[PDB]
Each structure stands twice: as C-alpha cells, then as structure tokens.
C-alpha cells in the first residue's frame, strides 16, 4: 500500500495473509485474500498461476504482522486451490483474476470466528456502490514501487471508485478494463495498492455494512497519474463463487 496508515487485524478481521513454502523450507509472502465463509478465502488467480500446488501454501487469519506473531492468529493448510479457468493476461491487464482457497487447520477444522477473525459479506449484483464512493484497501504490499522489501505490518488506505466510462478513456486504460473490473484511485494519485497487495480486499460500506466489492488485481504502477488501481468486480462473479464454494 502506497501512503495510508499502518493498521491492525481488528480493523480488517477478514484479511487473510497467504504465504508459500519453498523446496528448502523458506517461506515467502505471496498475496492477500479475504475470508468469505469459515472454510473459504477469496483471492486473485495471478497470485498462484505460476505455482498452483496447494500443499506449498500457508494461510493465516488474525495476523497483523508479516514476520512476527499476533495473539489469536490461526494458521491453515489449503485443502483446495481453485483458479478461474478463463484467467488470462496480457503484459498489463489480468482477466477473470479471482481464486478460491479452501482452508483447513492442522486439526481438520475451518476458521473459528473471533474478534480478529471474521467473514466479510459478499456483494450483490443489484447493489453496486456508485462512482465517487470511498472504499478501503488493505495489504502487506510495497510502500513504494522502489522498495525491495515488504512492510513488517499491515497497511490500509482509502481510494475512490472511478466509473467504467472514465477508466476506458485512452488516457486511462482504454480497452484493457472491462465491466468485470472496477477502477479506484486517489483523486491526487498519492495513495494506492502496489505489488504485494494483490488478492486483497477492496471494501465499501453499503447500507452501513462492510462489503467485499473488489479484489486487488492489477495496475500500470502504484500511485500513478491517470492509471488507477484495478480490481476484480466481485459482484460479477457470484455464480462462479457459489458454484465452487
């Protein structure tokens, strides 16, 4: 996350931190995700498409820090990793960039909700937030495009939804954005998602309820003039989600 603030998992209790174990045992951070039911985390397919072996993945819930522990955190294996069959990408845009991870504890259980571990409500295709709405993005991604390392602590910021009509202009993203994607950015282009934030939640408040509106997917850069963050539009994948969960 470029700009914004550090946060704690109490402020985003659906946030899932996804890591991968390598051959020799070293574990690296992959991507964010969101808990949508006790057994299911939703994320982005591009996070896993090069390494789709489920056994290598580690999912944490209730975790506020990258390499230190948070009391009440819970660790999971991935029982099923489901990538979208029609995922595609060019050198910039990701299409159908959505993935499901069925999570399972060492003890064979799904998540137990707590103060720091909670599901987030799925959106409805009838209840879109209007352009100009402010939404929250969260993740462990780079604080600058030029940073080699990720931050040691979760961050969050606020961005505003941008209309499809506007995002499709040649000087924004033209034909690279579709109606299955949402654009969002800072009006002054100083806060944004970045590398490492993929798979994480774009959350908007609808009728007072925190709702999973987007999944961090791609951008030309991070906090870059006329180049918004682009998010998978969750309300346009409800059948896919229900079929697989």
């Amino acid at each position: 996350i470029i700009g914004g603030e550090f946060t704690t998992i109490e402020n985003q209790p659906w946030f899932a931190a996804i890591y991968r174990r390598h051959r020799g045992g070293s574990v690296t951070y992959v991507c964010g995700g969101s808990l949508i039911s006790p057994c299911w985390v939703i994320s982005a397919t591009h996070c896993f498409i090069d390494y789709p072996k489920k056994e290598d993945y580690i999912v944490y819930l209730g975790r506020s820090r990258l390499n230190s522990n948070t009391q009440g955190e819970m660790k999971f294996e991935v029982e099923n990793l489901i990538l979208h069959k029609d995922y595609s990408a060019d050198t910039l845009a990701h299409h159908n960039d959505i993935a499901l991870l069925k999570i399972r504890s060492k003890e064979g259980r799904c998540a137990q909700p707590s103060r720091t571990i909670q599901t987030i409500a799925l959106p409805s295709m009838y209840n879109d937030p209007q352009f100009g709405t402010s939404c929250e993005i969260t993740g462990f991604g780079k604080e600058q495009s030029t940073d080699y390392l990720y931050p040691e602590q979760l961050k969050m910021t606020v961005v505003k939804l941008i209309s499809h009509r506007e995002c499709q202009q040649p000087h924004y993203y033209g034909s690279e954005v579709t109606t299955k994607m949402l654009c969002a950015a800072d009006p002054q282009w100083k806060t944004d998602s970045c590398q490492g934030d993929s798979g994480g939640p774009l959350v908007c408040s609808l009728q007072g309820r925190m709702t999973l509106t987007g999944i961090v997917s791609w951008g030309r850069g991070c906090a870059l003039k006329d180049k918004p963050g682009v998010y998978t539009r969750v309300s346009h994948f409800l059948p896919w989600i229900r079929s697989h969960t």
């Binding site: 030029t146 080699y148 590398q195 951008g219």
Partner: peptide, 13 residues
C-alpha cells in the same frame, strides 16, 4: 521471475 505481477517491475532503491 517477474512476468506475473500486480504492476510492471520498477528498479529498486
């Protein structure tokens, strides 16, 4: 490598 990213790689500082 860095063929799959959120956004095209930027040289590190």
């Amino acid at each position: 490598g860095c063929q799959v990213n959120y956004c095209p790689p930027v040289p590190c500082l």
